[PDB]
Symmetry: C3
Subunit: 330 residues, 3 copies
């Protein structure tokens, strides 16, 4: 039948176009692909002045609010803090969250099984005028974090600046690239701010802009902590010039249920010696932590992947022809 042969030739040309256009060209079969080794450095620029009640103003700079100082892909920026200063070791009242005692007989000498705050001496001492708590041995100024400041102390960190330097290298093709592309210059970095459409290559990011692109509000996050993830994609074709290779930045907000464990917080202490006595300042910091992940793949023309793709296409063509012949046989 003539129409049967026409349909056969149609299937032939269809599978030919499929194997020549989709596999070979669209999927870049004619090339070999390799991954990269990446290194990320972060630098924050911004200053925050916080005026605590009954205390002098405190200035926080790059060395203050960025917790990992050397610089890492995962870093925490301080947004709010509860400060307990002049902590010294002694026998003193514990926090009421641990337990409340009405008499000394209720207290038991030892340490609490869970969430221990110290070694209970065995006496019930008044924590304040109303309630009394067990006397424990430890840092006498107890961090009381029941009250969290509604306005963020380091609210200016909403619009500070962040510079991310990402250096990637493909060793298979021996090609090293950096986020500071040829289009980016010094005068550009002097005044540019990153934008999704306007300034994609600008390496200067605003923290509030990053949080908004992630899908979260900075003010709510700065109150109790947050998690933002920055993904850097280096997908490019090495057949073209190296100037075409440009990184793509994506922002995601990692959040959970608000009623259970909201935000991100940690406790750190600074130890010093004053008047011959060892003391420490404790800080419970709620901040927005940024995790940077870089993933990229470089593909360059090679003869062996091309030959393998040609062989696979010939095999698929043969299988399709055999299946079409079996269908026409009925």
């Amino acid at each position: 039948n003539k129409k049967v042969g026409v349909i056969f030739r149609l299937i032939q040309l269809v599978v030919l176009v499929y194997v020549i256009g989709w596999v070979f060209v669209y999927e870049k079969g004619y090339q070999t692909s390799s991954g990269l080794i990446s290194s990320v450095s972060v630098k924050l620029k911004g200053l925050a002045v916080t005026q605590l009640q009954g205390l002098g103003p405190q200035v926080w700079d790059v060395a203050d609010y960025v917790f990992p100082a050397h610089g890492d892909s995962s870093f925490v920026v301080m947004t709010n803090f509860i400060m307990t200063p002049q902590q010294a070791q002694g026998h003193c009242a514990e926090n009421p969250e641990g337990g409340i005692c009405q008499d000394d007989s209720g207290c038991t000498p030892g340490k609490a099984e869970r969430k221990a705050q110290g070694i209970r001496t065995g006496n019930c001492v008044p924590f304040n005028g109303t309630v009394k708590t067990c006397e424990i041995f430890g840092w006498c100024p107890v961090e009381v974090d029941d009250k969290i400041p509604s306005p963020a102390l380091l609210h200016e960190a909403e619009n500070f600046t962040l510079f991310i330097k990402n250096s990637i290298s493909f060793p298979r093709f021996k090609v090293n690239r950096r986020n500071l592309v040829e289009e980016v210059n010094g005068t550009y970095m002097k005044k540019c701010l990153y934008h999704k459409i306007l300034h994609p290559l600008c390496p200067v990011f605003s923290l509030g802009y990053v949080v908004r692109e992630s899908g979260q509000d900075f003010r709510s996050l700065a109150e109790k902590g947050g998690v933002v993830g920055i993904t850097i994609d280096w997908e490019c074709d090495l057949d073209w010039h190296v100037r075409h290779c440009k990184p793509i930045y994506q922002f995601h907000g990692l959040y959970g249920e608000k009623n259970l464990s909201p935000g991100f917080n940690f406790r750190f202490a600074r130890h010093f010696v004053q008047n011959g006595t060892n003391r420490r300042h404790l800080f419970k910091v709620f901040g927005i932590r940024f995790d940077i992940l870089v993933d990229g793949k470089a593909g360059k023309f090679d003869i062996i992947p091309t030959m393998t793709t040609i062989g696979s296409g010939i095999g698929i063509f043969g299988v399709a022809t055999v299946l079409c012949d079996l269908l026409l046989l009925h």
Copy 2:
């Protein structure tokens, strides 16, 4: 022959069941899978009181034994420490390991090529009553770590509490999940300990339980250091409700030969100013390094993977039928 056709139809139905059940249903070929972006936060709750010989009691809290105080997937929990306090710069005797001298002529001014402890002034000064060492310029109190306390100072850290908050997000399908699930509530988080069978969803882990699940005794590791790895798997099917998505926690113990460099140890110093002089307290810490790795994928139904799997199954069926016909022809 009828038996030939029976065997042919048998092979046909076998390969049909294979392509319809294994590749499609079992391997979830109709679904497409995507990776996740994950962030991990750790919080330690526990307190250790250490009484050193000829020194007042020392209290260690979350700020103390957690050196990555900011919060990272890889963190070290202090289990034992050797303390050298009141280190000041000056010309003093070095450790015997660097070298033992009997006269000043044996000493050579300069710095050691390997394991340099300081700048040798060139005079042999008595390190103690028996042996004499080269005088070097540096921290005068030299840390002597020949004696390691057999009972772990922070042995209570065996049964402290650890809270791990893991937030994962699959960008393609735009689904965000957290280690805390609907089954987990606040009252549950108040009092629960993780177990492989009893409490698989409890986010509170005991350090001793974590180490024992890794096949390691807590005492021997805490004495000289250890390495524990926690892997979090988020394998789930997005065709069902998100409530079914639950993570799986697995514990591994990374250990080496005991005679050659046993355990994990590091050294850190705290600098301060006392009486107008800059001094420091040095600590050689033997602890357990916890490395947290999160790996998971999400699979959801899609039409293009379904069509590709159907095409591949039809092709495999055709190839199998052709091979069976060729075998029957022989």
Copy 3:
């Protein structure tokens, strides 16, 4: 035709050797492969003495120039530093890089939009004899990074010693390995330096040798910072003894353009209390960031991958025979 059958048998034997030799033996298709969980610890041993102008000699040890003192795969080794000591919070002249004022009217009370150095009080005070800058409320000793020392202060770090402890475990085959192979012993670790050909198994690395293997000169990097990446490959065959499993070390230099943001640098501060006043010492550190990445494969013989490879080879053989018959028919 006889030659037709000869060519058919030739194609048959060729595809048979291909499926049995390349797909089965060469690619190890009969072996199933699994990944590993790895942990890396770093220890630096070196001493550097720096004599600043008008200041006493400063000694830097492992606790000093290793800012990630706890021990991480990514660590920074200090090579040069600019020190601004005795910083106190007050009203003082700002750095001239922010702005230069000729009168008090030019100053505006508030904070700078970009690169803010403090809160301007609206007064123009002389920064030095020639120029005047805006008066800001912050740390009064201003870090002036215009002059960078041409010779690296911590130049000795060129030939210090780095020890890496890498513990890997393949969970599927429950096999744990460490970089301290059977060939390496304690006496060997006492005196050895890693070499690409001479001492591949020695776990002691010289920083200068590591940087030179990455194609970078240590002097120019130590002057203003650098980035080195160490990759550890654990590819091995579990069919043989575990002694044959040995790690391979590769070094990659991650560098960028020199005119635009050269090297790696960061700022850190040490806070203390002197004479009842809280002060801090600021340090701008230019160092070499070492990023350690470990990736490995373990292959062990299994029956199911063997059967799958045999089936795939039989299918490819059948397809090749069918295609050859179709070509001969033409």
